[PDB]
Symmetry: D3
Subunit: 123 residues, 6 copies
Amino acid sequence: TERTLVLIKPDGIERQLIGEIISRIERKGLTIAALQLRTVSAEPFFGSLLEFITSGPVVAAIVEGTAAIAAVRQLAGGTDPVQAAAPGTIRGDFALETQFNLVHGSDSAESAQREIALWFPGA
Amino acid sequence: TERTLVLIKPDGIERQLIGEIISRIERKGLTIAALQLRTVSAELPFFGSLLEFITSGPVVAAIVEGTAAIAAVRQLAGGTDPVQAAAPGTIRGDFALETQFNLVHGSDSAESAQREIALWFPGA
Amino acid sequence: TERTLVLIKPDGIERQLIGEIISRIERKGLTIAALQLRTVSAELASQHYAEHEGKPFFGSLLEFITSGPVVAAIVEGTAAIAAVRQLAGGTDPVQAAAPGTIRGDFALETQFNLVHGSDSAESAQREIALWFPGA
Amino acid sequence: TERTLVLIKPDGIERQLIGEIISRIERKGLTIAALQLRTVSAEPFFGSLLEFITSGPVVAAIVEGTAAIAAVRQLAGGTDPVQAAAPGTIRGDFALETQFNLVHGSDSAESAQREIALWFPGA
Amino acid sequence: TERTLVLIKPDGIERQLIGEIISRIERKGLTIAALQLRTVSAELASQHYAEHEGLEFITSGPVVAAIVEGTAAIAAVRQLAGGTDPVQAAAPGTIRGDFALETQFNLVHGSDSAESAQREIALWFPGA
Amino acid sequence: TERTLVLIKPDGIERQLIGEIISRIERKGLTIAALQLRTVSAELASQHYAEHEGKPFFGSLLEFITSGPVVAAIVEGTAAIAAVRQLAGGTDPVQAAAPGTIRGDFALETQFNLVHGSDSAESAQREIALWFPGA
């Protein structure tokens, strides 16, 4: 039904949490339509590879399923891992501060459209 | 103590989540007092019937008991809509995407639990 | 595809390991064709363990299996019989059960080794006919 | 950065949840800076070993990391495990009533400083 | 320190076991140096399975290919995957022993030697 | 019925696997009778590894075990000694440790194999008296 772009941020990779994050997406009922470990370099940031991340390794993925956009953001949790993110979310269970909150998901069908076109051309 | 009836809906059985759902119940501190995989045929106001809270298909019925069992099960299960209502950390919040296929049902009150238990587990 | 009978014995119920045990069966790719928590009557216990009559441990097996409720299930799928035995592990949870099995991960001694699975095709048919005559 | 005191109450030890509770602290990004299984006898109760626990075995730990105090309270959940603790917390996932809610974490920076000096002198 | 090729076979994607398989690789202490979900073509499948000279399952659905790196990565991955037959050979606690039932659908593949690791990596991840 | 000494070596502490290791001991049915995170003194190191003195690698053992904190524990229960060795797995995490063990699932090489458990009843008594004098 819906498609959303999810990024596992560099801190998520450095902490060996790639599979744990994918598992929570998969058990939610969502499917991994695209997946790739990427390296993003240095050099406002709207529509670029650095829009939601700092330069470093990142895992991009197209997540597909019913209500995928809203469900991914549900799984991820609020921005601040302690102040806003609910327990049981990726950020609530695994993160401490906003600067290193592990994951990003599209915030709208509008964003998912361009984001997916940016990271997975022709998808 | 306290008793409530749980149903693992057909979508929960199809997705191989029987043990996962029971595990969450047990780790909460609740005990499985009864348990049975059932089949329910299509019956053509659904109150007090086997199809009250489920559609036609296989289902696992279970009596769960323990302190605050009724509210505890409702907490573990989560709100109706697994994305807009169910909190993360719940069965529905963690494993489901749409209301029609939200995996589980738990009695919402003592009188419901009493009625549903006698239906699915006569004599218990 | 095959069918086998799985028993979660009273110690597995007492330890609230029902979900964990069923989870290991499901993730293995096997399906639960029948499932029931029940108490074992003296008659059924003597039927289930008929092969052990005359052996010194026969009496204690009957006592234990009737000491508390069990969970019986029919597990179905490709090579279900051998797959369940693999998941369960060897008899002695420490000296025989490999790590990663139910007994290897959760049990310490033989008389409290949590689960049982039919040991062969003939036993599977015999035990299913006994525990689930309608299946 | 911060440090807080965690107690695993006797009921948490009885239910064999020491590793589970410690596991949830570590996967949050926090570190166990000190740890000890203690026995506490029975003797208001402010500043004493029995302030947040009844007599019985207890596991005391110093938990360290960014926002450690608030993070541990988040992981633990509200007092009543069913009416207050959120799903995905230790109490929301593992406990049923306030009398046996498994775990305690310092509720403030002053409590952490005070509780740490009591359970781990010289720390 | 070694590199090895890991393939999550089409049955592994279908059963939504990508994260579970990668989790076991990571907790073992190994790192994911490359990762990609992709569809396998006839040409590539013939190169990978060129060892069988005497209509392929690898081209039915997508697969996840990955380079896994770390100390004794090659042997460690084989240990994690388990023997070929998930019931008769794979040890409990392995990917196959815990999640699979028959050789036809044993979920995952890992390079069986240093030589095959280099040939498989050069085939699936040229330029890596 | 038995007690054994369990060490989470500095690499197990560095990798934040304390809870994972304790969980595997607990779910096996074993109990934690003693538990403490501590730093190993020079004296304690030479005492724990005294059986390796004179060997060339004796210096590397002392340096590693004092390179960072450890968690020491007394694990108790039926067959606790053999059960802990079962959970930990063989020495080499890849070539000897079985899948499903602590070393088989989390470690790659011998010098960083995370945990140690007493290998016999004599060793258990000797190691407990050294690490937990009052126990």
